Design an enzyme around this catalytic site. Sequence first.
Site, PDB file in Angstrom:
ATOM      1  CG  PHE A  32     -52.356  53.162  97.274  1.00 55.35           C
ATOM      2  CD1 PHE A  32     -52.175  54.348  97.981  1.00 55.35           C
ATOM      3  CD2 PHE A  32     -52.717  53.232  95.991  1.00 55.35           C
ATOM      4  CE1 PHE A  32     -52.392  55.585  97.430  1.00 55.35           C
ATOM      5  CE2 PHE A  32     -52.927  54.461  95.399  1.00 55.35           C
ATOM      6  CZ  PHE A  32     -52.733  55.662  96.127  1.00 55.35           C
ATOM      7  CG  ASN A  87     -50.111  55.370  91.084  1.00 55.13           C
ATOM      8  OD1 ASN A  87     -49.532  56.466  91.156  1.00 55.13           O
ATOM      9  ND2 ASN A  87     -51.218  55.079  91.776  1.00 55.13           N
ATOM     10  N   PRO A  88     -46.200  54.990  91.358  1.00 55.14           N
ATOM     11  CG  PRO A  88     -44.320  56.186  90.897  1.00 55.14           C
ATOM     12  CD  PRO A  88     -45.723  55.938  90.348  1.00 55.14           C
TER      13      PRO A  88
HETATM   14  N1  LIG Z   1     -39.303  50.723  95.148  1.00 62.28           N
HETATM   15  C1  LIG Z   1     -40.457  50.088  95.127  1.00 62.28           C
HETATM   16  N2  LIG Z   1     -40.511  48.931  94.465  1.00 62.28           N
HETATM   17  C2  LIG Z   1     -41.664  48.212  94.360  1.00 62.28           C
HETATM   18  N3  LIG Z   1     -42.767  48.664  94.950  1.00 62.28           N
HETATM   19  C3  LIG Z   1     -42.742  49.806  95.649  1.00 62.28           C
HETATM   20  C4  LIG Z   1     -41.595  50.536  95.771  1.00 62.28           C
HETATM   21  N4  LIG Z   1     -41.889  51.666  96.460  1.00 62.28           N
HETATM   22  C5  LIG Z   1     -43.202  51.636  96.769  1.00 62.28           C
HETATM   23  N5  LIG Z   1     -43.729  50.473  96.300  1.00 62.28           N
HETATM   24  C6  LIG Z   1     -45.131  50.037  96.348  1.00 62.28           C
HETATM   25  O1  LIG Z   1     -45.786  50.953  95.475  1.00 62.28           O
HETATM   26  C7  LIG Z   1     -47.185  50.971  95.676  1.00 62.28           C
HETATM   27  C8  LIG Z   1     -47.629  52.455  95.632  1.00 62.28           C
HETATM   28  S1  LIG Z   1     -49.395  52.881  95.625  1.00 62.28           S
HETATM   29  C9  LIG Z   1     -50.103  52.494  94.025  1.00 62.28           C
HETATM   30  C10 LIG Z   1     -50.613  51.043  94.086  1.00 62.28           C
HETATM   31  C11 LIG Z   1     -51.241  50.634  92.778  1.00 62.28           C
HETATM   32  N6  LIG Z   1     -50.314  50.645  91.662  1.00 62.28           N
HETATM   33  C12 LIG Z   1     -52.329  51.610  92.401  1.00 62.28           C
HETATM   34  O2  LIG Z   1     -51.999  52.250  91.378  1.00 62.28           O
HETATM   35  O3  LIG Z   1     -53.307  51.632  93.140  1.00 62.28           O
HETATM   36  C13 LIG Z   1     -47.359  50.327  97.052  1.00 62.28           C
HETATM   37  O4  LIG Z   1     -48.086  49.130  97.042  1.00 62.28           O
HETATM   38  C14 LIG Z   1     -45.961  50.096  97.619  1.00 62.28           C
HETATM   39  O5  LIG Z   1     -45.853  48.842  98.240  1.00 62.28           O
END
Ligand SMILES: Nc1ncnc2c1ncn2[C@@H]1O[C@H](CSCC[C@H](N)C(=O)O)[C@@H](O)[C@H]1O
Length: 264
Positions: free
Chosen positions: A88, A185-186
């Site tokens: 991402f 930042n999920p």
């Molecule tokens: N339950 C979960 N546990 C850990 N990681 C997760 C997850 N669900 C989604 N992700 C991860 O969450 C990220 C979301 S995008 C945001 C990526 C980064 N923090 C930024 O702010 O640019 C992705 O890389 C995906 O792999």
Amino acid sequence: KIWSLIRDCSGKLEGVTETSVLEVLLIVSRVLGIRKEDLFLKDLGVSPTEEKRILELVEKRASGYPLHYILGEKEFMGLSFLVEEGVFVPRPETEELVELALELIRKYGIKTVADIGTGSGAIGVSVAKFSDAIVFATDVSSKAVEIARKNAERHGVSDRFFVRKGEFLEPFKEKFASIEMILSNPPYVKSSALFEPPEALFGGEDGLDFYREFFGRYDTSGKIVLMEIGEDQVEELKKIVSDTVFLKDSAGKYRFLLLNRRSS
Ligand SMILES: Nc1ncnc2c1ncn2[C@@H]1O[C@H](CSCC[C@H](N)C(=O)O)[C@@H](O)[C@H]1O
């Protein structure tokens, strides 16, 4: 010239981009193999292979494919983060979370911090590089884990930024207790809706699965939880997590949930 090339490459992009010229400027630098400030010198012509690569990449872009994937890089909190398909691409809105995070480390003397869903590592790597915190980072993507590890090496913080593959904080259980601040930042997009990973945008039918699972499984007593959120998810978030506060970004859209259960 190369300034004509530039001006024609860009009209080709008054589609997908509002900032076509700049995107052209950047795609040109990258093929020419140059820092962007060199485009301005004299004796700067672009020879075939070069001109060839540029309309190539230029149209791979008129399509909507990501600039930053072409570029291989995205600047975030002033740093250069390597990005590739599968990871991402850091968004500007998220720098705000980090500055709020930093203010928090200084306000409290916080030393241990986690970054759920690290992606390229933009959040934790920046928190590491700009404060004294130690950071535990996770991603379900093994591709994110990889890139994030390198961005940590790339910025001199592999000794204070550790990434483990897996979900939520499941891979750092041994450490849960010692963690003071949890950052993320999920995914928060209504899956009830593009080249970035699904795992990274989609948050179930209503775009909340992530928070429901997280505030559902983890005891947050004593911790500060700061997470990015969809503009419209406040009222429903107030019912999964009742004691949270909610902030607006520099724009005025609600963007962050702050749940501060540190004490005294
Ligand atoms: N339950 C979960 N546990 C850990 N990681 C997760 C997850 N669900 C989604 N992700 C991860 O969450 C990220 C979301 S995008 C945001 C990526 C980064 N923090 C930024 O702010 O640019 C992705 O890389 C995906 O792999």
